[PDB]
Design a protein around this nucleic acid. Structure first.
Lengths: 51, 520
DNA sequence: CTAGTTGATCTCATATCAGGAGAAGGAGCAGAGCG
DNA sequence: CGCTCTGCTCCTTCTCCCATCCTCTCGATGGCTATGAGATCAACTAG
């Protein structure tokens, strides 16, 4: 379960740079590796790579 | 008539029109039909590969082989350019079949599903495109097709594309791929093609990679240990043996004496980057963006696009008589000017290809700037105007040069009218430029043709050239012969951002064969 | 009606040290039935 | 007479917890993840 935006608000700094929450960065890592694992299982990858 | 094993009689007049190799093909296709297996017609393009399907299906219908009384409803999936070409071909080489086109152009002018039903009931030959296959996997895969020919079937080379899955939803065993190059980048493409034609032969995709792609690839690298070279050699031979029955690949050397093609040439020209071109390239390689890409902070593709553009023309930045797309601003355009000058003086028809589409526009405005009468043909040119454009260019010699994007420019069009071919822009895919250059040197090309590959020395394009060479060697190692020489020129790393301009078997035959393979 | 044009809009292809306390598990082992 | 099934010890992980509230300053970090060709389709635009 990925929480809503209220639990991880993207606070705007003095300028326009929108800083993301720690939860959002972590979910970014999770989605990155999840997509990476999904393609590695779908396409050519070694068993140790998937592991 | 000509007669084969069980009941296959193909009409004699039709047979006599064929060549010897095309006759072999027809026999091969029928043997597959007997096995109920599929195959890849990997004949090199121009070798009249399509005619073989016509002959075989004609013979099958005529023989009335016994669910189906001869030839049932069948679907042809071919690239959008060539649909009417196939219709024309069926119509001439065998009028009796009904060949319905499934397209916006089409000829039906009602709902399409009615047409699908009509063909599936009256047993026609439904031509369609890969898109309409992707978009009506539901409708189309409800009608017990008898044959599922895919022309230029390499488009199914991605096992996960939607079109691939849609094509692999068809149920009949009589699946055929007509693909001049059934392997273009790596064997994953091969597995995909075999999994359409013959779903189990090469195993699952993971297992295929594990067992074949990894070893065969590792044997190509320059630094590979000899042990690994020999594992690659073994695996490559196993693969050829596995795929031998189901791939009929006649190159244009085992038929040349029996077919009499003209001379072919493959010159390469290492173009030199002009001053402004050099400056923009030298700056952008030194730019922070390239440095960040080297650090892996974002996608590499952006950098590669930028570099290719720079080498292709300074269209990163535009600089009277210095308007956008000015020839003198970029060296390759200077070379093209000289070549088209000499060739126009030779009264010769040229065929200029470009991987890009907007660059095809800059080439177009150039050819306006010159007095060269051209005809341009890319993805934006209407499909209905496509085959008539090809026919027009082939019928008269008034049209001198023929701008082409390689993606529609390749893929089954016949362009025998042109004589000289120049590949202006490299690709990461060797097959693209190969089919491009092969548009001319086909059956019916009654005049000599030479191929010029224009390349920028020391820039990205040379490294892309190295990529497509390494790919070509990998394809050769598994299609033409596994004794390929190792690609020693480069280590093929991410240092391609630099500018370095010039200046019964009786169980002893078996065991002997086994010992041979396992000695490697 | 019919080509032609034009947005969207999708798909596909390209690359490599001054904590402490308590609770839970495991290991070693004495010993007691007991078959 | 060896096998089991306790159940005691001892160690060893292993986890958790560490007053309230309030003021100020100061330093760091605060990113996109791209491109283009071809095909469909539906909107117009002209004929």
């Amino acid at each position: 379960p990925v929480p809503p935006l209220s639990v991880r608000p993207a606070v705007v700094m003095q300028g326009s740079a929108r800083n993301q929450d720690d939860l959002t960065h972590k979910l970014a890592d999770i989605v990155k590796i999840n997509n990476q694992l999904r393609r590695n299982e779908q396409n050519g990858a070694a068993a140790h790579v998937i592991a | 008539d000509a007669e084969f094993d069980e009941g296959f009689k193909v009409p004699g007049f039709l047979f006599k029109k064929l060549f010897k190799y095309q006759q072999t093909g027809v026999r091969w296709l029928w043997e597959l039909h007997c096995q109920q297996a599929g195959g890849i017609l990997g004949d090199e393009m121009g070798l009249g590969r399509t005619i073989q399907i016509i002959a075989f299906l004609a013979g099958l219908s005529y023989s009335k082989i016994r669910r189906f009384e001869g030839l049932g409803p069948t679907v042809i999936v071919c690239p959008t350019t060539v649909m009417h070409q196939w219709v024309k071909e069926f119509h001439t080489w065998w009028p009796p079949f009904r060949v319905a086109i499934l397209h916006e152009t089409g000829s039906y002018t009602h709902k399409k599903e009615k047409l699908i039903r009509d063909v599936a009931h009256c047993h026609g030959i439904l031509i369609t495109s890969y898109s309409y296959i992707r978009l009506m996997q539901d409708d189309i895969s409800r009608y017990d097709w008898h044959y599922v020919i895919l022309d230029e079937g390499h488009k199914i080379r991605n096992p996960n594309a939607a079109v691939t899955l849609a094509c692999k939803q068809f149920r009949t065993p009589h699946r055929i791929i007509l693909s001049g190059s059934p392997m273009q980048n790596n064997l994953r493409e091969l597995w995909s093609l075999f999994d359409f034609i013959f779903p189990g032969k090469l195993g699952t995709l993971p297992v295929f990679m594990e067992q074949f792609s990894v070893p065969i690839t590792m044997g190509g690298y320059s630094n590979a240990s000899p042990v690994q070279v020999k594992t690659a050699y073994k695996c490559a031979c196993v693969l050829r043996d596995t795929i031998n029955p189901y791939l009929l690949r006649r190159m244009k050397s085992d038929v040349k004496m029996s077919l009499s093609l003209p001379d072919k040439n493959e010159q390469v020209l290492f173009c030199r980057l002009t001053d402004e071109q050099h400056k923009v390239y030298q700056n952008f390689v030194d730019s922070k963006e390239v440095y960040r890409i080297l650090n892996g902070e974002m996608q590499i593709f952006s950098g590669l696009i930028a570099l290719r553009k720079i080498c292709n023309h300074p269209d990163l930045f535009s600089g009277e008589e210095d308007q956008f797309g000015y020839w003198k601003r970029s060296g390759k355009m200077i070379v093209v000017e000289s070549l088209l000058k000499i060739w126009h003086k030779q009264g010769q028809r040229v065929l200029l290809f470009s991987q890009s589409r907007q660059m095809l526009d800059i080439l177009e405005v150039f050819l306006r700037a010159q007095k060269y009468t051209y005809l341009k043909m890319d993805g934006t040119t209407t499909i209905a105007s496509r085959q008539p454009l090809i026919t027009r260019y082939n019928e008269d010699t008034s049209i001198f040069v023929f701008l082409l994007t390689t993606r529609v420019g390749g893929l089954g069009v016949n362009l025998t009218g042109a004589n000289r071919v120049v590949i202006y822009d490299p690709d990461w895919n060797p097959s693209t430029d190969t089919q491009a250059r092969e548009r001319a040197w086909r059956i019916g090309q009654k005049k000599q043709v030479t191929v010029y590959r224009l390349l920028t020395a020391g820039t990205i394009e040379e490294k892309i050239y190295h990529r497509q060479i390494f790919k070509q060697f990998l394809t050769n190692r598994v299609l033409k012969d596994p004794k390929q020489r190792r690609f020693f020129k480069s280590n093929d790393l991410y240092e391609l951002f630099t500018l370095t301009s010039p200046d019964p078997l009786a169980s002893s035959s078996l065991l002997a064969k086994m010992r041979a393979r396992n000695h490697l």
